[PDB]
Amino acid sequence: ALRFEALYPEGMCPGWSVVVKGKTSSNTSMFEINFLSHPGDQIAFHFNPRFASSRIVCNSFLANHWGKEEVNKTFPFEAKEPFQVEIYSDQDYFHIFIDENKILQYKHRQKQLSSITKLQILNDIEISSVEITKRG
Amino acid sequence: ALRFEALYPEGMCPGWSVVVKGKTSSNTSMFEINFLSHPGDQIAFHFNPRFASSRIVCNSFLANHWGKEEVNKTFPFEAKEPFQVEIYSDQDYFHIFIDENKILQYKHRQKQLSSITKLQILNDIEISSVEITKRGLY
């Protein structure tokens, strides 16, 4: 289910940091953080920690379909343990830092960065804080 | 991927030691050592050092689900450096050591100890030795 959504019509990319703090209830579930663009509610960036396999899956949902998955084996998450995910975008990538260490970068596929106006957080995450801050 | 598996059909629990020597390839991946019960290769005991968070998770898959995870208080391992892990079983626990220093004990949840016939080692460990030894004078 949808746990949190934010809308910033002036565009939250590039140059904004998103910090999500929370914890996941189950050791077999998953959550996701999506950045969506208008028009068409396309998913520019989908970030999906999967606890059953201890993998992070990233992708984009453009032209009504997913593209190639980018799978990361660095998995700094444990069920029921608080975590902090920071996502920052520059001209070329989304950058992910978890518990203050750099984890991965994801090259933009949606180039219309300024049309990325929506943040969505779904599924198994009990959110304690969301911060959205201009840094660029 | 599977790095090593051993099968001792008469049952390697309780009263056996397993010594695993090796090192990780990555600073931020993980490996696991599982003890599997027969029939079905069922996960009686799962030991999972996780280098991204520096946490050890232990659990068992019983009655169709993972049980309560035990997250160890300490994480003595260093990535990309040789280690020696020793695991021994008695009637009550798996006892785990690094360098012969105790890390943790895990109380048996699967009570059919004699059905634990397989040792399986998965994911980010470059193995240099596995020794499986019956403890005399049990």
> Which residues in chain A have Cβ-Cβ distances shorter than 8 Å to B69?
27, 78-80
In angstroms, what CA-CA distances link B2 with A19, B33, B80, B124?
36, 10, 19, 10
> Which residues in chain B have Cβ-Cβ distances shorter than 8 Å to A75?
30, 50, 52
Kindly state whether A88 is in contact with chain B, defined as any CB-CB distance less than 8 angstroms.
no
Nearest to A121 by CA among A106, A132, A111, A133: A132
Resolution of the structure in the document, Å: 1.1
Cα–Cα distance for residue pair B14/B87, rounded to 1 Å: 11
Architecture in CATH of A1-136 = Sandwich (2.60)
Name residue B118's amino acid: K
Sign of CA dihedral B25, A21, A59, A78: positive
A50 strand-pairing partners: A30, A55
Residues A95 and A17 sit within 8 Å (Cβ to Cβ): no
The H or E element that residue B87 is part of is strand B83-89
For B115, the 3-state DSSP assignment is helix
Residues B105 and B94 sit within 8 Å (Cβ to Cβ): yes
Cα–Cα distance for residue pair A116/A9, rounded to 1 Å: 8
> Which residues in chain B have Cβ-Cβ distances shorter than 8 Å to A78?
50, 53, 55, 57, 69, 71
Listed by start position, the domains of chain B span 1-138
Determine, for residues A79 and B69 on separate chains, whether the beta-carbon distance falls below 8 Å. yes
Residue located via tokens 């260093």:
B78
Kindly state whether B70 is in contact with chain A, defined as any CB-CB distance less than 8 angstroms.
no
Give every CB contact of residue B110 below 8 A, 6+ residues apart in sequence.
Answer: B37, B42, B44, B45, B60, B62, B116
Structure tokens at B72: 């160890």
B116 strand-pairing partners: B37
In angstroms, what CA-CA distances link A116 with A46, A51, A64, A119, B46?
12, 27, 16, 8, 42
Cα–Cα distance for residue pair B50/B27, rounded to 1 Å: 10
Residue A114 is classified by DSSP as G
Structure tokens at B15: 């009263």
CA dihedral of A70, A73, A76, A80, whole degrees rounded to 10: 90
Helix/strand/coil percent split, chain B, to 5: 0, 55, 40
Kindly state whether B66 is in contact with chain A, defined as any CB-CB distance less than 8 angstroms.
yes
Whether omega for the bond prior to residue B14 falls within 30 degrees of 0, making it cis, is yes
Q: Which CATH topology does B1-138 take?
A: Jelly Rolls (2.60.120)
> Which residues in chain A have Cβ-Cβ distances shorter than 8 Å to B124?
73
Half-sphere exposure of A7 (CA within 13 A, CB side): 3
Residues A117 and A37 sit within 8 Å (Cβ to Cβ): yes
Cα–Cα distance for residue pair A4/A120, rounded to 1 Å: 6
Determine, for residues B55 and A81 on separate chains, whether the beta-carbon distance falls below 8 Å. yes
Determine, for residues A28 and B52 on separate chains, whether the beta-carbon distance falls below 8 Å. no
In angstroms, what CA-CA distances link A11 with A5, A43, A59, A118, A134?
14, 14, 20, 8, 11
Angle at B97 between CA B95 and CA B102, to 5 degrees: 80
Cα–Cα distance for residue pair B88/A127, rounded to 1 Å: 40
Residue B135 is classified by DSSP as P
> Which residues in chain A have Cβ-Cβ distances shorter than 8 Å to B71?
78, 81
CA dihedral of B86, B48, B70, B19, whole degrees rounded to 10: -10
Cα–Cα distance for residue pair A129/A120, rounded to 1 Å: 14
Kindly state whether A80 is in contact with chain B, defined as any CB-CB distance less than 8 angstroms.
yes
